[PDB]
Amino acid sequence: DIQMTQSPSSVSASVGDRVIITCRASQGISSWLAWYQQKPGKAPKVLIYDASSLQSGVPSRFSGSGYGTDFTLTISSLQPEDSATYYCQQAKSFPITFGQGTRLEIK
Amino acid sequence: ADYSVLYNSASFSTFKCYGVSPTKLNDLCFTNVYADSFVIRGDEVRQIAPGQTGKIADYNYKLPDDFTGCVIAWNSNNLDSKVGGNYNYLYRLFRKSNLKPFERDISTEIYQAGSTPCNGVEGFNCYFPLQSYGFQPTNGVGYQPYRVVVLSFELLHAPATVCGPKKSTNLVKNKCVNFNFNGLTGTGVLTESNKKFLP
Amino acid sequence: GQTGKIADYNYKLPDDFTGCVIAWNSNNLDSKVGGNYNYLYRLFRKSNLKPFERDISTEIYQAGSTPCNGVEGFNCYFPLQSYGFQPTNGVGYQPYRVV
Amino acid sequence: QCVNLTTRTQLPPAYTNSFTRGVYYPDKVFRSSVLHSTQDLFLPFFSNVTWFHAIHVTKRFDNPVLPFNDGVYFASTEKSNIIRGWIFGTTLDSKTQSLLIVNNATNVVIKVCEFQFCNDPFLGVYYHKNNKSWMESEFRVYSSANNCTFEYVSQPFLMDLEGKQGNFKNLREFVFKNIDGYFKIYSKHTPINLVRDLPQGFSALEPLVDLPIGINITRFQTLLALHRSYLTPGDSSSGWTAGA
Amino acid sequence: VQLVESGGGVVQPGRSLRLSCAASGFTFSSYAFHWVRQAPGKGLEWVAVISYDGSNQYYADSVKGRFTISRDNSKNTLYLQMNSLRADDTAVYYCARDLAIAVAGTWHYYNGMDVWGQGTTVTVSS
Amino acid sequence: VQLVESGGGVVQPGRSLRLSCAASGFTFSSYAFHWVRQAPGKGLEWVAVISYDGSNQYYADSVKGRFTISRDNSKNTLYLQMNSLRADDTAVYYCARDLAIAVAGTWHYYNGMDVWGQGTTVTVSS
């Protein structure tokens, strides 16, 4: 049962800022990570799947890559509509484990 | 290359080998050693044997004939074949002729098997060359290719760069004997000294 | 001393041999279409053998990879091995008769 | 960075004499109270050895190129460790494997990678009060090393560690040879007290290192540290001195 | 693509409940589904899954033994039976769908979550 | 082990015919096969041979040019096509397997007949 971690828990930025989110897997899950962005009153939506792809329709501002243990999500511009929560997810096998959560703010 | 760890602690069952066994290799001196590992049919992992024939991998991707190798066929369930799936074994499955060993023929084009190419439509007499193994968390060991390591037994004239012996024996004094230090051989009795050498 | 070293696992001549070797072709009758396989040639031995020996002992030794105890799965088979004569062959694969 | 420094002043090369110097142990065999006759590559007695100098007083930065025909006897006499290392190769265009013996900041490092040698490859150090250390921020010897075949790190030699410009005390001898795909380096250190030239004495050079590189060597260059300091204020590309 | 959810209950002490999430806007018979819960303000948690054929089922560590899954292709709808109700089971459940990756003409599952429903706030009290 | 044969013809004057023989109880791919002819009361005859891999196929002097043989290991069945049949083609056909001798682990074919089928009678007239 892989314990799957995400960091950090509180960062703030506005409009033209680039931010970085680190996310770690206990075992080697290779390039199987899913990134989400959950609004406080809306269901989460997928942004990056297979640790390299981006879902058709999501703005190309988000960019993330990784293979194995460590994964990095880089946001070039934090436009004032992305103040939501991000969860990781490893798809190696059952059971599916989500991340602890990361909260964004606007400075 | 200390091949000692190959046979020091290992449990490679069903081991076959043509030529010289990799164990006790420090006796022989050479320049270049090659170990070739490749991906084959998942259902033919137990069916790889010298000679014989078969419908698959005979008219599209031919295995090397008169292959001199050393098959160490140990099953693997944790080193490779990670659960969930894997998509890295992509190679051409349909071709009109054979394929030379280690031939990198990869192309995004649709292979044409018949006399009339298909215009990117899934119809008759036209099959895509690339194929991805349908790996599953419970796919089975009979369909997930498990690697079987094999080497190349070959000779070529060249000055050795990776080569060196080691036998080791206790050092005996006050008894004359034939001796072999590093390179230098002789016969006589060896005693302690008081001479001082430069380092 | 001309090696052909498996044949020197089989039949060896001394260094000062005096006499004559005679060989001729037998592709007509030693190898023919539809199976000819009744000659065996001792793939490998434990050590080189002195001139003019036979070494008829053909048993599954427990030597080589591991002690087989007759398994034959680790090349411990009594190495009489294959025959390899067919009517087509190559120019250097036909059967010859030699005295 | 190809830098391509300028402001070069010309003077004729000066020669001097080899007073019974340049002898190394030919083999690894011990002998005692014997006379032995050997036939090998040596530096002949009383030959003309060149005298390269680097003093500002008029610039006279000295980094020529030299050929490598059979071997080289190098000798240095200084106190501030102005010299850094040596660089070896045939074509020097990153198409042929080369050699980059450098003293570096911490330890002696050796590579066999191909390096994109610029027109003027050299090293230097910067001077400031921000950090006490004199960092080797100058790495303008190549741009990209596509592939490598060997790499080594070893113990650097120890010296007087004097950052002054007094009478010379540090005298170093080196011999570089290349035979049978084997690169041999011999060396020795001898403390001296003299203003210039070489003393009258004899001492043999002990083997230092052997390399199984198996490469081809034809050309030689030296690598000296361009120690910029407050003595020559200005920008990096024009104001620089090589000390003494 | 749209997923509808129903089956909320104000109070459910140790009883039986049956949630149902439907699918519309795509082929129901060529995809697999999910159930992903969420406590009121906590992280995100998965509880059960049904394969696209429905022959194989999987649950979680604290879910197995009490929760059952079912599906039907005639109505294009799947159900979750939910029993043995403790006082700490209040959360916000969601019905999800697997991504299907197509490589070399082969479809694969278990790659992420794409389609999410409105969500049902399921609570238990005494 | 068992072999089945079919494809008889009541009369085939200048027509095409297909004989089919299938195998059960053993591997169909690891053995070469023979088609055998028997005249009504005369000596036994041979018409064609197919190899285990199918690379080499052979026919007879009076068979070549008008008859054909083929095999298929997916259905464990091999067939004989009959074209330009003269009135002297009435006989009984058999589908048989080849003896393989294992010497030092090497298999040798084309040694003799081991397994015989029931035999299908094909008669031709005017």
Residue numbers in the entry:
A (entry chain K): 1 to 107
B (entry chain C): 363 to 561
C (entry chain B): 413 to 511
D (entry chain A): 14 to 70, 76 to 262
E (entry chain J), F (entry chain F): 2 to 127
Paper passage:
The rapid spread of the severe acute respiratory syndrome coronavirus 2 (SARS-CoV-2) B.1.1.529 (Omicron) variant and its resistance to neutralization by vaccinee and convalescent sera are driving a search for monoclonal antibodies with potent neutralization. To provide insight into effective neutralization, we determined cryo–electron microscopy structures and evaluated receptor binding domain (RBD) antibodies for their ability to bind and neutralize B.1.1.529. Mutations altered 16% of the B.1.1.529 RBD surface, clustered on an RBD ridge overlapping the angiotensin-converting enzyme 2 (ACE2)–binding surface and reduced binding of most antibodies. The RBD is a major target for neutralizing antibodies in both convalescents and vaccinees.
For class III antibodies, only one prototype antibody showed complete loss of B.1.1.529 neutralization. We determined that viral escape was mediated by the G446S amino acid change. This result indicates that potent class III antibodies might be induced through structure-based vaccine designs that mask residue 446 in RBD. Additionally, the existence of G446S-sensitive and -resistant antibodies with substantial epitope overlap suggest that spikes with the G446S substitution can be used to evaluate the quality of class III immune response in serum-based epitope mapping assays.
